[PDB]
RNA sequence: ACCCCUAUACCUUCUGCAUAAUGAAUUAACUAGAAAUAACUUUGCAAGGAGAGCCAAAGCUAAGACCCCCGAAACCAGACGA
RNA sequence: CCGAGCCUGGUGAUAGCUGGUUGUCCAAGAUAGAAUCUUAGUUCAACUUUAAAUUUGCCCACAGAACCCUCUAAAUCCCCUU
RNA sequence: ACCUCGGAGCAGAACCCAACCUCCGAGCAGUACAUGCUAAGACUUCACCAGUCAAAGCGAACCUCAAUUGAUCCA
């Protein structure tokens, strides 16, 4: 997925990450970074030296139960599942830019 | 009655105009086909379904490498309307033992031997 | 007022359908793919006498593996450990 | 076929099967050909010869006759001069 | 057979007009 | 034997610990439910 | 009627019947009921073999 | 008719497609269409069909 | 009556707790509640495809609105953004159109520049510079 | 909350039912798969098994697993009724 | 409520006919015909399911499968390689 | 009106293939009396029942035809 992130906010991603809670992580694959009065675009990704996005793992949980019901009429066809997918919450801490333009 | 169709061999005889339209060289032809299923076998006869199963094109848009030999060529001629055939070309050599892990099919048919993720 | 006899798309009198630009273009591009397939199926590499037995050994080995799998069928082994550790059902403080 | 009899609660046997067929202990049933003694004046010697044969039954027919008979008729018999003594066992049969 | 080069080899009533 | 040495641990055998050999007790099939009901075979 | 460890007996039986079969024999081990099941008929060979081992 | 056949400008011909079984079109066509070349439909003849 | 059912109430409640917000007799009567809850759960399962499709349609509508505000058309904007190797999806494109209008105007200007370069290329076959916001970056 | 978008109740019966084909107001309770021959699996013992009888050219013994509910118009016997 | 009364019993009469046949989840799974007082049913084939044993199964190439009149078609059978 | 059996077409080139579809027929006849006896291997009207061909051998001289038909019990 592509996320429009800024500093201080939260992102919910729908799977596990094999990280502990509180771990700080560098979010690579930055394709746009914009401030007031200017914007930098990648083709398709910006350079490693240019942008640096940091995110900390804040919560490892599961989703609310999702019902998967299958039904067909006049066929005695009825099935039901409940699924809870894993989820990780990431807090974006900082987005730094370097003069290497 | 609907039956299997036998194709005249004059269909599979390229002209110099065809050799100009496509980049194939009638001398030293290509060893391997890349074949990709691009059409479902539903509403198609059971023999075409079986031939697709034998060729291993059960999954659509998944490339499979095959020989350029008459037996498999007849097999492909049976279901030629459901698939795409391209030559497999090797810009570098064949994959070696120490470069077998880092390879990529790299559509346009060029099986590249080294696969970095950096711009040139 | 514009009424078609029963089951529009079957029978003697049917609702007419006409071919748009989409359908013609789709047919033409699939025909182009088929023509390129005809081209690439025109230059074989081993002329059908040179391919007489170049894979016989490997196909024989594959079927030998298939037969080995088909004949290596037997009930699994039975261990004292499972029967004895079913006793753990009533393991109290110790 | 009287799976349970009103007197003993036992399975019964169809006696037509016993009157018409012979069971070898291996599991094979032997019968006679139909019409083997009817209108022999319109039949060729080859047809009559193949009609005089004692032949084996189908797998389906064998299971049907086993169902229709009781296990008494499946025991191993040791008659004195049985002409079918050598046929009660199978030899050189593989699976 | 009818699809074979040797088809119609046993044709004789075209020879005997009788 | 190692089996009685294993039993030296292994809390005592009682009527709350017994269990048949797997494969001996085939499970009964009942005509209740979606799969085995509505026509019952 | 095996008594003691049965895996050594399985090893010995496999080593004995591998040359005769050309492949390792298909075998099931039952420790709780100390029996050894082998795929195929080898009754006379195994009887002679065990007699020679002295059982 | 011959002149129209030779100076036809599109590269896709009923004869070619039907005889090569392009797109698997023989499941819709008839065994007689290999010789009728799309010019005949039942008892009707199309003289502009090429 | 050996072993009749005792906890039928809990099964009835298992079905009925998903009908409390219904209307009519189907929020309390099991014989109708069960049918309507079955239909509701089937709808819940099938609604995921529609949610994806409808959210994409909303993104497309919003991007069309913003592009027409800048004078562009949606196909032109999407195609030329692809041709500039900037791979932003409809979601983030609508996000920027709503919350970063300066960035969206820059994106529309870049797409228009690439479109003009494509027209010039179709006119002149390159010869010389084949455009500046052309010249795709190669990877190996 | 509604307004927006998507969506032709269920069961049975059928080639095919939203069907304007059946059945059903609704709640509670009651209300419908019973077993053999022979096989399969798991034990015991083993040229023998089985607690008499029976089977046996690896068999025999034991266990497990397995075959619904409602409905005619009828027929007969004996009573009871002008 | 008499084309042959009513009640009880035989009687849980019989019904190839209609209706109904109750927890969860997963998996494989759509049939050429023959006979039948039989075509509203059943039995054997066929298809389908499970478990076992073993080795080939499908796709296929040359060569090959009377004639006769007038054509004799799309195709088929057989079939190593693959 | 038909119900069993055979030949042709439909059903064009292995097999099969419906119709209250189109056409022909059959329910015998003629000749030896080894038209004796046995016995590999096969075919098969889509099941079964029925039906079909046949080497070698023992004996003895040196079979036509398309259908031409009827199970069991019982007498
Ligand atoms: Mg209508
Ligand atoms: Mg129900
Ligand atoms: Mg109807
Ligand atoms: Mg409908
Ligand atoms: Mg209705
Ligand atoms: Mg009705
Ligand atoms: Mg009603
Ligand atoms: Mg009666
Ligand atoms: Mg009467
Ligand atoms: Mg009076
Ligand atoms: Mg009843
Ligand atoms: Mg009805
Ligand atoms: Mg499935
Ligand atoms: Mg009936
Ligand atoms: Mg047959
Ligand atoms: Mg002879």
From Swiss-Prot, chain C:
Pfam families in UniProt: MRP-63
Localization annotation: Mitochondrion
Coiled coil: none
GO CC annotations on file: mitochondrial inner membrane; mitochondrial large ribosomal subunit; mitochondrial ribosome; mitochondrion
Domain of life: Eukaryota
InterPro entries: Ribosomal_mL63
A GO molecular function held by the record: structural constituent of ribosome
Keywords of the record: Mitochondrion, Ribonucleoprotein, Ribosomal protein
Cysteine pairings via disulfide bonds: none
Family assignment from sequence similarity: Belongs to the mitochondrion-specific ribosomal protein mL63 family.
Subunit structure: Component of the mitochondrial large ribosomal subunit (mt-LSU). Mature mammalian 55S mitochondrial ribosomes consist of a small (28S) and a large (39S) subunit. The 28S small subunit contains a 12S ribosomal RNA (12S mt-rRNA) and 30 different proteins. The 39S large subunit contains a 16S rRNA (16S mt-rRNA), a copy of mitochondrial valine transfer RNA (mt-tRNA(Val)), which plays an integral structural role, and 52 different proteins.
Record protein name field: Large ribosomal subunit protein mL63
Organism, scientific name: Homo sapiens (Human)
Organism lineage: Eukaryota, Metazoa, Chordata, Craniata, Vertebrata
Recorded name of the encoding gene: MRPL57
From Swiss-Prot, chain F:
Domain of life: Eukaryota
Cellular localisation: Mitochondrion
Region Disordered, annotated ranges: 13-41
Composition skew (Basic residues), residue ranges: 27-41
Subunit text: Component of the mitochondrial large ribosomal subunit (mt-LSU). Mature mammalian 55S mitochondrial ribosomes consist of a small (28S) and a large (39S) subunit. The 28S small subunit contains a 12S ribosomal RNA (12S mt-rRNA) and 30 different proteins. The 39S large subunit contains a 16S rRNA (16S mt-rRNA), a copy of mitochondrial valine transfer RNA (mt-tRNA(Val)), which plays an integral structural role, and 52 different proteins.
Family: Belongs to the universal ribosomal protein uL15 family.
Protein's UniProt name: Large ribosomal subunit protein uL15m
Encoding gene per record: MRPL15
From Swiss-Prot, chain G:
One annotated Gene Ontology cellular component of this protein: mitochondrial ribosome
Location of the protein in the cell: Mitochondrion
Domain of life of the native organism: Eukaryota
One function term, GO molecular function aspect: structural constituent of ribosome
Keywords: Mitochondrion, Ribonucleoprotein, Ribosomal protein
GO biological process terms on file: mitochondrial translation
Tissue: Ubiquitous.
The family this protein is said to belong to: Belongs to the mitochondrion-specific ribosomal protein mL49 family.
Subunit text: Component of the mitochondrial large ribosomal subunit (mt-LSU). Mature mammalian 55S mitochondrial ribosomes consist of a small (28S) and a large (39S) subunit. The 28S small subunit contains a 12S ribosomal RNA (12S mt-rRNA) and 30 different proteins. The 39S large subunit contains a 16S rRNA (16S mt-rRNA), a copy of mitochondrial valine transfer RNA (mt-tRNA(Val)), which plays an integral structural role, and 52 different proteins. Interacts with OXA1L.
Name of the protein in question: Large ribosomal subunit protein mL49
From Swiss-Prot, chain H:
Signal peptide, first to last residue: none
Coiled coil: none
Domain of life from the UniProt record: Eukaryota
Protein location: Mitochondrion
Subunit structure: Component of the mitochondrial large ribosomal subunit (mt-LSU). Mature mammalian 55S mitochondrial ribosomes consist of a small (28S) and a large (39S) subunit. The 28S small subunit contains a 12S ribosomal RNA (12S mt-rRNA) and 30 different proteins. The 39S large subunit contains a 16S rRNA (16S mt-rRNA), a copy of mitochondrial valine transfer RNA (mt-tRNA(Val)), which plays an integral structural role, and 52 different proteins.
Family: Belongs to the universal ribosomal protein uL16 family.
Protein name per its UniProtKB record: Large ribosomal subunit protein uL16m
Lineage: Eukaryota, Metazoa, Chordata, Craniata, Vertebrata
């Amino acid at each position: 997925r592509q996320w429009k992130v800024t500093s201080e906010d939260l992102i919910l991603i729908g799977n596990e990450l094999d990280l502990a809670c509180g771990e700080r992580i560098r979010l690579e694959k930055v394709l746009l970074v914009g401030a007031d009065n200017f914007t930098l675009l990648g083709k398709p990704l910006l350079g490693k030296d240019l942008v640096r996005v940091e995110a900390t793992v804040i919560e490892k949980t599961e989703s609310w139960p999702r019902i998967i019901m299958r039904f067909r009429k006049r066929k005695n066809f009825k099935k039901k599942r409940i699924v809870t997918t894993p989820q990780t919450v990431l807090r974006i801490n900082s987005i730094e830019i370097a003069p290497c333009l | 009655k609907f039956t299997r169709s036998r194709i005249p061999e004059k269909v599979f005889q390229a002209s110099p105009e065809d050799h100009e339209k496509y980049g194939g060289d009638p001398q030293n032809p290509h060893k391997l086909h890349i074949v990709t299923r691009i059409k479902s076998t539903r509403r198609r006869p059971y023999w075409e379904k079986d031939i697709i199963k034998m060729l291993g094109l059960e999954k659509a848009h998944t490339p499979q490498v095959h020989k350029n030999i008459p037996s498999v060529n007849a097999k492909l001629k049976v279901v030629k309307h459901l698939i795409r055939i391209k030559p497999l070309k090797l810009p570098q050599g064949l994959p070696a033992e120490e470069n077998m892990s880092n390879t990529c099919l790299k559509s346009t048919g060029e099986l590249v031997v080294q696969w970095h993720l950096k711009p040139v | 007022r514009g009424r078609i006899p029963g089951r529009q798309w079957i029978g003697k009198h049917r609702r007419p359908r006409f071919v748009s630009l989409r359908a013609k273009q789709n047919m033409i591009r699939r025909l182009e793919i088929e023509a390129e397939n005809h081209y690439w199926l025109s230059m074989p590499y081993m002329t059908r006498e040179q391919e007489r037995g170049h894979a016989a050994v490997r196909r024989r080995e594959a079927f030998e593996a298939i037969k080995a799998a088909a004949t290596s069928k037997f009930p699994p082994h039975r261990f004292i450990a499972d029967q004895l550790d079913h006793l753990n059902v009533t393991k109290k403080w110790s | 076929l009287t799976y349970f009899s009103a007197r003993k609660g036992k399975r019964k046997t169809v006696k037509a099967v016993i009157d018409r067929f012979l069971r070898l202990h291996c599991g094979l049933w032997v019968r006679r050909k139909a019409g083997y003694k009817k209108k022999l004046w319109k039949k060729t010697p080859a047809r009559k010869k193949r009609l005089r044969e004692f032949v084996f039954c189908n797998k389906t027919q064998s299971k049907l006759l086993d169902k229709m008979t009781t296990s008494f008729w499946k025991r191993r018999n040791w008659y004195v001069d049985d002409p079918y003594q050598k046929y009660h066992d199978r030899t050189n049969l593989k699976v | 057979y009818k699809t074979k080069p040797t088809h119609g080899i046993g044709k004789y009533k075209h020879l005997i007009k009788a | 034997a190692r089996a009685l040495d294993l039993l030296r641990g292994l809390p005592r055998v009682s009527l709350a610990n017994l269990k048949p050999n797997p494969g001996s007790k085939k499970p009964e099939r009942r005509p209740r439910g979606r799969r085995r009901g509505r026509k019952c075979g | 009627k095996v008594e003691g460890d049965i895996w050594a007996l399985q090893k010995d039986v496999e080593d004995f019947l591998s040359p005769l079969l050309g492949k390792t024999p298909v075998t099931q081990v039952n420790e709780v009921t100390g029996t050894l099941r082998i795929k195929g008929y080898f009754d006379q060979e195994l009887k002679a073999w065990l007699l020679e081992k002295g059982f | 008719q011959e002149e129209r056949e030779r100076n036809n400008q599109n590269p896709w011909t009923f004869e070619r497609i039907a005889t090569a079984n392009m797109l698997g079109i023989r499941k819709v066509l008839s065994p007689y269409d290999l010789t009728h070349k799309g010019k005949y439909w039942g008892k009707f003849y199309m003289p502009k069909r090429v | 009556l050996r072993n009749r059912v005792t906890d039928r109430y809990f099964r009835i409640q298992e079905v009925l707790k998903h009908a409390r917000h219904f209307r009519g007799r189907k929020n309390r009567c099991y014989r109708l509640a069960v049918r309507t809850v079955i239909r509701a759960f089937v709808k819940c399962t099938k609604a995921r495809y529609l949610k994806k499709k409808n959210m994409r349609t909303l993104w497309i509508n919003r991007i069309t609105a913003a592009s027409q505000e800048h004078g562009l058309k949606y196909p032109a904007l999407i195609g030329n953004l692809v041709k500039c190797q900037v791979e932003l999806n409809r979601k983030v494109l609508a996000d920027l159109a709503i919350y970063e209008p300066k960035t969206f105007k820059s994106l529309a200007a870049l797409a228009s520049r690439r479109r003009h370069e494509g027209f010039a290329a179709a006119l002149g076959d390159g010869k010389e510079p084949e455009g500046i916001f052309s010249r795709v970056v190669q990877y190996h």
